[PDB]
Design a binder for these strands. Structure first.
Ligand SMILES: Nc1nc2c(ncn2[C@@H]2O[C@H](COP(=O)(O)O)[C@@H](O)[C@H]2O)c(=O)[nH]1
Lengths: 154, 90
RNA sequence: AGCAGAGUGGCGCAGCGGAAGCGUGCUGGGCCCAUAACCCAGAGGUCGAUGGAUCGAAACCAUCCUCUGCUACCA
RNA sequence: AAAUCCUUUAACGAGGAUCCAUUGGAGGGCAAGUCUGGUGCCAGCAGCCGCGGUAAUUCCAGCUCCAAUAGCGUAUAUUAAAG
RNA sequence: CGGGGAAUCAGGGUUCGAUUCCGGAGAGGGAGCCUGAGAAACGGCUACCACAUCCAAGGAAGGCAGCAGGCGCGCAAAUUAC
């Protein structure tokens, strides 16, 4: 009994780690205006989550201004201390390094404080976070996935 | 020909990347992408293009494949649009 | 915040200061049984705001607005 | 050896003599139906050639017929056909 | 395993022969030996190698490729009878 249950937890650990950051996780960020911005390399951004919770390694996008992208958020910190998740309306200062491209995106020029920050969720990511993410997955905020997959066209 | 609102073991799909030698590979409105075979009568008579709305005979054993039953056109697509088919364009 | 390289659906050309056209794309014909290629025609221009000596969309005193790329302090 | 089976022999035992003959075929190879329902290049058949896309001589059935017969299919090693 | 043979077949041939008769070999794998006319014997012993039985943990006892039967292996093979 113990050996079998241990194997179930071991396979859960073996599944979680080495198959990470593909389950991007639903994240809708509201910008907190009049916060100290670091321009580029890295971007230090003071934000408050409105839909879902936000952890490290989730790619982000701004719609309306075409579909411009910021790939892989590196660290999320409250004030000075590090945090693993957002507390549904926290004043988190996040360190973000955009992925190596031909040019990184700039605040003001490309995206403004008014513009919404939405996570890049695809068929692969939603199918990845559907099965084998039902214990760590959010409680009663599900709907935003159906509400964001319709605007991302899935 | 008459309208056919048939969702009885068969699904509507948008043809995307129609590459094969009859392979097709379209994106179904309910589930994921599937290989929909060109059925006998559609081999030479009726032509399915790179972007098209089709009713595919969902063959449920393996589920990673199917076969195209019917090809739709603008008027029937616009009708289907009207009743049940996602706001996904036609 | 600053700097830099450019502004016509779309790639570049242009002058002597009198005065705006080329390749490609789009549309309508023809040739062919049919497509392509070819042969005829068509539409598409506030040359980003210009104050100036004026024969200035222009050359610059670049004054100013827009877009793209780069540099700058990690809570 | 003791039994069994057989042979022998009283009694019982045949009118859908319901005391019931199957396994494969019926386009050609190759003996036997261009008969009638069903399906509509879907389902399937087909060793090979081929048959199926709305009058299917070939599929699923009914009827009829052919082959061998208490047996007859199917797969696989091997022999003749193989000059 | 080898022969005597088997299937097929004009003549020539081809293929099979673990299997009831003859000869050889081995008793899980090797090795060494006692007794006896005859054995390098395994329903004799001695040791090691591989497996495995009992146990009071001190020690003890193993050999179906004999007939039944069981497990395994696999497409593939019978009764713990008199
Ligand atoms: N009408 C027409 N079709 C042609 C001609 N040459 C080729 N085609 C088309 O191209 C097909 C294949 O020709 P090829 O292999 O490209 C033909 O079946 C036909 O549809 C021609 O001269 N006339």
């Amino acid at each position: 009994f113990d050996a079998f249950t241990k194997y179930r937890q071991d396979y859960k650990k073996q599944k979680q780690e080495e198959f990470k950051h593909i389950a991007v996780f639903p994240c809708k960020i509201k910008i907190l205006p009049q916060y100290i911005f670091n321009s580029r390399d890295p971007i230090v951004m003071g934000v408050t989550v409105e839909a879902g919770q936000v952890k490290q390694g989730t790619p982000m996008c701004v719609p309306s201004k075409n579909f411009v992208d910021i790939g892989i958020v590196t660290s999320i910190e409250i004030n000075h201390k590090q945090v693993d998740v957002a507390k549904k309306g926290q004043e988190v200062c996040v360190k973000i390094e955009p992925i190596p491209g031909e040019s990184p995106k700039m605040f003001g020029r490309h995206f403004e404080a008014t513009d919404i920050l939405v996570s890049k969720i695809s068929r692969q990511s939603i199918d990845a976070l559907k099965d084998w993410f039902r214990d760590e997955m959010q409680k009663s905020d599900w709907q935003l996935i159906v509400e964001l997959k319709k605007v991302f066209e899935i | 020909r008459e309208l056919v609102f048939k969702e009885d073991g068969q699904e509507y799909a948008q043809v995307i990347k129609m590459l094969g030698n009859g392979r097709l590979e379209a994106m179904c409105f309910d589930g994921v992408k599937r290989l929909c075979h060109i059925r006998g009568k559609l081999r030479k008579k009726v032509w399915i293009n790179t972007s098209d709305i089709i009713l595919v005979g969902l063959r449920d054993y393996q589920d990673n494949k199917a076969d195209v039953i019917l090809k739709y056109n603008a008027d029937e697509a616009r009708s289907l649009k009207a009743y049940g088919e996602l706001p996904e364009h036609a």
